[PDB]
């Protein structure tokens with residue numbers, strides 16, 4: 324099988340600057356009809372891959388002229404003349420000159436924007452959930468940059484471990500930020516044994532860590 | 543060119559995965575898959591005229607066929623295991639002639655297929671109740687398989703919405719949160735409802751989100 328080596332894996336770029344993505348094939352991609360079946364796609368978060376380029380350098384209808392493709396034989400490049408916020412996502416090269424057809428590993432373009440502190444919000448479990456025997460406590464970190472953030476759960480000032488899960492959004496196509504949700508899960512019995520529920524957030528945008536808290540039962 | 547993709551989103555291990563792709567010339571149709579959080583893998587092709595080509599990595603478990611009269615294409619993958627869990631895509635391109643054909647020009651919306659012996663389970667929806675900005679949301683808990691879709695105010699509220707990737711709990715059920723930031727001044731006047739849809743269990747839940755009563 325033809326190995327398609329794509330580089331870099333991660334591509335942080337300043338808004339308005341050019342970008343270059345390399346795709347190197349282990350075999351010539353020149354077919355017997357004189358055509359080179361090398362394609363490029365952009366996969367935006369939660370969307371299907373969308374074709375940008377085909378036949379190395381041909382732009383699909385509707386694709387902005389900021390995108391261009393070049394190369395021959397084994398070394399190919401996708402260039403973006405001036406990166407825009409909506410260009411974030413994962414770019415893939417593909418060869419179909421040889422069977423089986425093979426894709427590059429992908430390149431994730433990230434906008435390197437200014438530091439943005441997260442806005443922190445805490446949510447107690449609903450009375451509806453408490454009736455079912457479980458308590459989910461949610462901490463939200465909204466619209467921050469860079470991605471690096473730490474969430475620490477405290478219950479009556481005791482550090483929690485192994486009872487939380489978190490997930491992070493992909494970089495926003497408009498404001499270039501991330502958001503994160505952390506859920507602390509306890510049994511109703513364990514939840515009722517304690518008073519102070521707190522979420523402590525550490526991030527570059529915060530001069531000192533931010534703690535959001537509530538006292539169980541208070542409206 | 544529009545591509546409609548259909549098929550079960552849950553398949554038991556050892557059973558056959560079946561997907562359908564309808565194109566609305568002639569066409570060349572390719573199938574591609576993407577395991578969660580990973581890259582793209584090419585599965586196979588059906589050429590204009592019916593010739594096929596498959597990825598040897600599928601160890602001859604794969605079949606692609608075209609309906610005799612319509613541009614409808616079927617993907618069959620036998621003896622599935624958890625390694626076959628992925629979003630499956632069909633992609634088409636024009637076949638003008640033997641000297642002018644293309645590939646991967648138009649892609650369908652993907653179909654997630656989860657290979658599991660577990661039963662479908664609808665979610666429970668709980669409110670995440672709230673100067674100058676307020677946050678609110680919905681916790682969509684204990685469902686299987688993925689995905690769930692969440693909208694706010696029947697699609698009228700899109701700005702400031704963040705629907706997080708689901709997490710798999712130790713119970714083997716998924717949990718997801720959807721949040722929205724709004725002006726704190728809007729809380730007394732504007733109604734906020736999260737619309738949750740879980741197609742595998744045919745569950746549709748509308749949850750009004752408001753502060754807890756004092």
Ligand SMILES: Cn1c(CNc2ccc(C(=N)N)cc2)nc2cc(C(=O)N(CCC(=O)O)c3ccccn3)ccc21
Nearest residue numbers: 354360419420421570572587589591593594595644645
């Ligand atoms: C490697 N390769 C290319 C490179 N370009 C290319 C563009 C796009 C795509 C793509 N869309 N996947 C795939 C490749 N073109 C090819 C045409 C044939 C072919 O004509 N036969 C016979 C067709 C019949 O007998 O009628 C065929 C076709 C499919 C399978 C098996 N055999 C074989 C191999 C080819």
